[PDB]
């Protein structure tokens, strides 16, 4: 038998090309491997985690190294709003001379790619000033990578393999992750900011050479130990402070100013330092909750068992959940992915509105790239969370041990849940599409005054509550007389209200009927994607059509054409369908973000306000209008620096469309075709000297769905990325 | 010997497929790499002499992109010199000999990899037997010494910041140039 | 030897040599009967 894959004899004995494909595709599903024990599983996962951390640190090392070596960081910091930051050098012998010239327009004498990752802005903010700073950073992270790699190896050695009990010590892990991983890391970062970033921002060099002798504040730690902490707030940077200079510089190391530094258009560094110090305290306190080796603290199991509402509406409450969660890595991974998915979206939303990095608000292409990047990542994480939730229900859920707890009662009313999600999706769909189409028809026939245009008054009211004066709602922070307004008036409110009421930033954009309709579109997307994923999870174990589905596993082709036909009945198929909806939803919201900003940055908000209420407006004024720079990256007259994006744009279209082949044409067609090819090979002279070792077969039913989805998704991203980048570069 | 003998067994356990074909920590690889190092130091010496005595024509002249295409280009919009291109061509000659020798060896010559069920040669040890003449011993003596030489010369250049040619030239007493 | 030479040495190796050695090794691995 062909040895590969060694972890599955069933696959190893397969005489066809399917052996290789399925070998690759199941290599990381450790639970499914031959003769896996629970202890070996946890040990292998732990080592794999070390490997992953090393890869992250090598990637960061490479970014630092390439910028240090081939970048223009030292030149860029002298004029950050005018010079383009360099990602890395190009060496490509396929280039003709005209393309070499087109990519050599960034000050330096060799072809380069411009960076849109925002690394220069970040590194400058946090106190980096030279290529030697970057280089030593790169060296340091090489060493950290190696350390994690070594720890990975070490913890697979007999006398260093941790026990299963160590891996299920929930209370200790939570204490250390809260107080140490989060709390102390946050405290150390506040240290960096106070000792290095803030001095460097005021023109003072602080490095490893002089930091032991250079006090962050003239008063030292005397005020700290005397509880005279207000000393550290005295004398903030003036509104005329010129970043990276002493002109207008303050002495304060901790503040609560609110809003933005006028020059850099970013959050004050002294606010950021104080933020990190304050949350560090909270995290360190939070990490003393759970009982470890000294009797004080809580048991997680005891908390869960006790949380039953006495009126009985939650049944037995959270009884049994501790064991359910503690024995299921899929439950845990689903929780982790969901939570991280929410946080990644929050990062996208908060970083565009409240930027922390100097001059990044001016780098429009970077702002667009970063928003789109993080929202797409968040989308993937959310789908994965639900995928692992479904896998949990098949592989790890024990009905007996969860009887009448909150988890079991979800399954008890799954039809109520699914049918209501169906209703809300239909309700949003019919009416949102309906209004858009009303508007298109009435505008097309020359009567824009007949449009249905709903003011988003609830969102405008929430803006007013945070102090946006535009609407005249006179509520809370937008009223002078409010207790809310009075309470904060001597602290953050002056700085905050200035930023809110400034129209030349992204902090609470003006919103109108256009913003109303696309928010309901987004809501449609969230509900429908959720419908598909929830139906996936709650029907993973069985349905009327297939009552014994749990016996077939997460992923299987179907159950044949009987009982009416059962294509796409598995919980894996729900993941596959949800991916199309996730990509759609992310399309709508990123189109929205980008068009709203293109018109803001371009000084024509009216274009968005008028065009966005009917769908031809998006098609014409967004897609068609902004395509022009991109598709002229190369043409019969020559090439410019958008040539590469133009080519990638077409590559994306090609990959996407190739996906349709796998999604539309299904397996049996191809297997018959491959038979005739096997026939021809064996009957062709000379050629039939050569013999396959693996019998060629068409891809499996599930494999086709996966390969089709992969092409569809890769094509989606490789189309949109060049557009979003070249559109903005082309305009500004 | 106990340290070395154990180290060989450890490598053989980690990589049985490679060690069985004489790849890695083997006497096979030791000898072959010795032969290349010996030839290599001659090539370095000949390079130092050829540069000094002006054998390479238009050494410092840069190649044209129109004639030789895009491969002449280097990292930072620099072009390859004639000298460097020429030395590369010299190596391409003996690389093609190598490929021929590896895949299509002479019936009598030493082959690159071990045969299906051939054992390795016994390790020589800390000092091989001192047998003067065209012997396997004398080859292994000179091979080990050459590879030490290359290690030293390279290490010296980075540490001191001198060129390998300068180190070699000063090592011979400014004879080459 | 200088650093500006490095792309012209390395890119051909990472692009035309490393992948084909990797492909060859993987091919031998997956066809072994053992």
């Amino acid at each position: 038998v062909t040895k590969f894959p060694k972890f599955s004899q069933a696959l190893a004995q397969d005489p066809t090309t399917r052996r290789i494909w399925y070998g690759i595709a199941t290599a990381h599903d450790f639970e499914s491997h031959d003769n896996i024990t629970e202890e070996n599983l946890y040990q292998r996962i732990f080592a794999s985690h070390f490997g992953h951390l090393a890869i992250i640190f090598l990637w960061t090392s490479g970014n630092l190294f390439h910028v240090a070596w081939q970048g223009n960081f030292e030149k860029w910091i002298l004029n950050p709003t005018k010079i383009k930051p360099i990602a890395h050098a190009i060496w490509d012998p396929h280039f003709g001379q005209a393309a070499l010239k087109a990519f050599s327009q960034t000050g330096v004498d060799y072809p380069t790619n411009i960076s849109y990752s925002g690394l220069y802005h970040w590194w400058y903010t946090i106190g980096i000033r030279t290529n030697n700073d970057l280089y030593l950073g790169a060296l340091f992270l090489l060493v950290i990578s190696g350390l994690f790699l070594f720890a990975g190896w070490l913890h697979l050695q007999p006398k260093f393999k941790p026990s299963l009990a160590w891996f299920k010590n929930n209370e200790s892990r939570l204490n250390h992750h809260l107080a140490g991983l989060f709390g102390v890391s946050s405290l150390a970062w506040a240290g960096h900011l106070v000792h290095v970033a803030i001095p460097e921002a005021r023109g003072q060099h602080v490095g490893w050479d002089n930091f032991l002798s250079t006090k962050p504040h003239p008063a030292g730690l005397e005020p700290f130990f005397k509880g005279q902490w207000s000393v550290y707030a005295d004398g903030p940077d003036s509104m005329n402070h010129v970043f990276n200079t002493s002109e207008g510089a303050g002495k304060a190391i901790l503040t609560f100013l609110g809003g933005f530094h006028p020059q850099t258009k970013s959050l004050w560094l002294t606010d950021i330092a104080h933020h990190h110090l304050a949350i560090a305290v909270i995290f360190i306190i939070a990490g003393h909750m759970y009982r470890t080796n000294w009797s004080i603290g809580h048991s997680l199991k005891e908390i869960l068992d006790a949380h039953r509402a006495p009126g009985g509406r939650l049944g037995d409450g959270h009884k049994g959940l501790f064991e359910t969660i503690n024995n299921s890595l899929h439950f845990q991974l689903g929780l982790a992915l969901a939570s991280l998915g929410v946080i990644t979206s929050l990062v996208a939303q908060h970083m565009y509105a409240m930027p922390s990095y100097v001059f990044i608000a001016n780098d429009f292409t970077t702002q667009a790239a970063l928003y789109t990047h993080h929202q797409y990542i968040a989308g993937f994480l959310m789908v994965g969370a639900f995928a692992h939730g479904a896998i949990f229900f098949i592989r790890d859920y024990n009905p007996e041990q969860n009887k009448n707890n909150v988890l079991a009662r979800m399954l008890e009313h799954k039809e109520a849940i699914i049918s209501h999600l169906s209703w809300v999706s239909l309700f949003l769909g019919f009416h949102t599409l309906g209004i858009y189409v009303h508007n298109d028809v009435v505008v097309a026939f020359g009567s824009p005054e007949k449009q249905i245009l709903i003011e988003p008054v609830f969102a405008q009211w929430i803006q007013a509550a945070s102090g946006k004066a535009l609407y005249g709602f006179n509520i809370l922070l937008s009223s002078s007389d409010s207790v809310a307004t009075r309470a904060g008036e001597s602290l953050w409110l002056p700085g905050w209200l200035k930023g809110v009421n400034d129209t030349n930033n992204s902090l609470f954009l003006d919103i109108g009927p256009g913003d109303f309709l696309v928010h309901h579109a987004i809501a449609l997307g969230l509900h429908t994607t959720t419908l598909i994923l929830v139906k996936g999870a709650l029907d993973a174990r069985g349905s009327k059509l297939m009552p014994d589905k749990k016996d077939f596993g997460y992923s299987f082709p179907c159950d044949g054409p009987g009982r009416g036909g059962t294509c796409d009945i598995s919980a894996w198929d729900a993941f596959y369908l949800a991916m199309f909806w996730m990509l759609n939803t992310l399309g709508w919201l990123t189109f929205y973000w980008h068009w709203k900003h293109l018109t803001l940055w371009g000084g024509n908000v009216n274009q968005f306000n008028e065009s966005s209420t009917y769908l031809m407006g998006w098609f014409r004024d967004y897609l068609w209008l902004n395509s022009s720079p991109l598709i002229n990256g190369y043409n019969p007259y020559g090439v410019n620096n958008l040539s590469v994006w133009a080519w990638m744009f077409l590559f994306g279209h090609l990959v996407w469309a190739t996906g349709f082949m796998f999604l539309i044409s299904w397996r049996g067609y191809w297997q018959e075709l491959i038979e005739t090819l096997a026939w021809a090979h064996e009957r062709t002279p000379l050629a039939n000297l050569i013999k396959w070792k693996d019998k060629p077969v068409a891809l499996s039913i599930v494999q086709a769905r996966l390969v089709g989805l992969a092409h569809f998704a890769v094509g989606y991203i490789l189309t949109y990325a060049p557009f979003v980048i070249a559109s903005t570069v082309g305009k500004f | 010997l106990g340290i070395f003998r154990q180290a060989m067994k450890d490598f053989a356990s980690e990589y049985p497929d490679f060690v069985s074909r004489g790849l890695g920590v083997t006497s096979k690889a030791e000898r072959w790499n010795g032969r290349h190092a010996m030839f290599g130091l001659l090539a370095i010496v000949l390079t130092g002499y050829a540069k000094g005595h002006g054998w390479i024509p238009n050494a410092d002249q840069v190649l044209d992109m129109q004639q030789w295409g895009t491969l002449v280009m280097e990292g930072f919009n620099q072009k390859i010199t004639n000298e460097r291109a020429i030395v590369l061509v010299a190596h391409i000659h003996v690389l093609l000999v190598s490929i021929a020798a590896a895949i299509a060896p002479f019936s009598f010559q030493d082959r690159l990899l071990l045969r299906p069920g051939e054992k390795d040669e016994e390790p020589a040890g800390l000092l091989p037997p001192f047998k003067l003449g065209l012997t396997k011993e004398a080859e292994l003596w000179n091979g080990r010494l050459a590879m030490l030489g290359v290690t030293f010369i390279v290490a010296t250049s980075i540490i001191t910041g001198q060129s390998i040619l300068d180190v070699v030239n000063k090592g011979l007493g400014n004879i080459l140039y | 030897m200088t650093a500006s030479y490095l792309p012209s040495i390395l890119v051909p190796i990472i692009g035309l040599v490393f992948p084909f050695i990797s492909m060859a090794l993987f091919f031998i691995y997956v066809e072994q009967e053992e």
Partner: peptide, 28 residues
């Protein structure tokens, strides 16, 4: 700014994760 010497130090140091990656890969 960054010298040839600095680039060679980086390349030499990058052998440490390379070798260790090989070891971890094998052990997994």
């Amino acid at each position: 700014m960054i010298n040839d010497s600095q680039i060679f130090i980086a390349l030499i140091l990058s052998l440490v994760p390379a070798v260790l990656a090989l070891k971890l890969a094998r052990e997994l």
